[model samples]
Target: HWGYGGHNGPEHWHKDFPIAKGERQSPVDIDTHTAKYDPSLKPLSVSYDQATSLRILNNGHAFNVEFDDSQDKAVLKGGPLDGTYRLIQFHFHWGSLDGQGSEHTVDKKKYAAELHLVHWNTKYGDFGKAVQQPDGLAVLGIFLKVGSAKPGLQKVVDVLDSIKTKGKSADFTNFDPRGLLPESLDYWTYPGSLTTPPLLECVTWIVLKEPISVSSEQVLKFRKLNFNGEGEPEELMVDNWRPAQPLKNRQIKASFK
Candidate 1:
């Protein structure tokens, strides 16, 4: 029943998931002025093959592409990560309109949307087990700018109509997530949680500095999907991003000088 607005919104999230107000919450505003450039921070690395993608679906909150995570085929390492984390899935967060969708803002400036590549620490054996540990997950965040159409992202947008309702899914194969990445891997890293429910405090957030482009027309396709299921009152899925959380006792490190 949790959602982005009304009674089931983020404000009431702590009612069911207490960690929603916990110490290491996510989607915090990044004040570049306060962020320190750490020379020791290594470059971020992501190795994703086209064959890892299996399917795509709308889980009420947002649309995501599920990847085959049985092995370390598409893995992420380096940067703030201690070990190899297997790529499981990737999703997006957006607003009802442009310039108001991104979860993590740069210097309090919002982007058109945000993309999250979810990965789990392989040492824990499984995603369920890893999620409980402090260093179990790593999410690579990429902001979406409203500009020219991105061919890589457009591939995903083109399939939105096939799964226009909640619980709808389709076979999404041979997708190489590398196309979604920006030219640079410069990023901001910190301790945070998943932006959605359960709000687990186990994520090592690596948000990219540069944003990827997505045309204004393409984003409209995302709003075409209905939040309601097969016979329910139709409602469009938009503004699915959580607001910035308090960054208490936390120091955000930058991978650039």
Candidate 2:
């Protein structure tokens, strides 16, 4: 299995995953000075039904909260998307320290953490099938800054103990995902690949400009997650963010001026 450290880290992933070295690899550095400002982009419309949230899983990589996307119960539209994209799942990437962690860096600086909200295009039917097409997936990326406590995320943090080890899970429901979003909907869009392997080049990256704040105390809890399952020696799941990739010819478009 691949990991963020040792022999199986991001640098060596390309040895196993062909697409890891592909031209469109993600977690690109967003040099806003060069990013084109487009006023024509529409404000993002993200709505989620509290009942649609299913369960949370600690998949060894990160803690992912799954959703029931059966009928667009939770959806992301506008803001660089052509068709409606159903909310599939949400996860985070973080490092041991606040200075570095976020996958997407802006102006060569990293935030305390980064959140990823994965969605699949409704035009392709299901998430499994939709993930293959070029425009199959859209991921909303929000950077997390360390500051005050996030009461809305408390519900999520409370369940971390149940899913401490890999493969562990806990029942979760009636949670509004909007609790995770920042005040501003302004974002930058580009074409990029998944940070992890098979590293598919199918995602249309939508990274928010305004970052949500969290406390360092809350960030510490993420480090407690078990990277290794029961039986093996415990491995702290910290510093799971991938390094920035080349931008190629893709121009990042901003939603606001």
Q: Which residue runs of candidate 2 sit more than 4 Å off their true CA positions? A: none
Q: Scored by CA lDDT, what does every candidate get?
A: 0.92, 0.90
Q: What is the lDDT of residue 134 in candidate 1?
A: 90
Clashes of each: 0, 0
Across 1-257, the per-residue lDDT of candidate 1 in tens digits comes to 89975779899899999999999999899999999999999998788863389999988889999999997899999998899999999999888899798999999999989999999999999999999999999999999989999899888999999888889999999888999999999999999998888999999999999999989888889878777776788888998889999999999999999
Q: Positional deviation of 59 in candidate 1, in angstroms?
A: 0.7
**CA lDDT of 69 in candidate 2?**
87
Estimate, for each residue in 45-128, the C-alpha lDDT of model 2 and write its tens digit: 887753388899999989999998888688998988898999989999999899988999999999989999999999998877
Query: Which stretches of model 1 miss by more than 4 angstroms?
Result: none
In model 1, what are the clashing residue pairs, if there are any? none
Model 2, residue 227: distance off in Å is 0.7
RMSD after CA superposition, every candidate: 0.9, 1.0
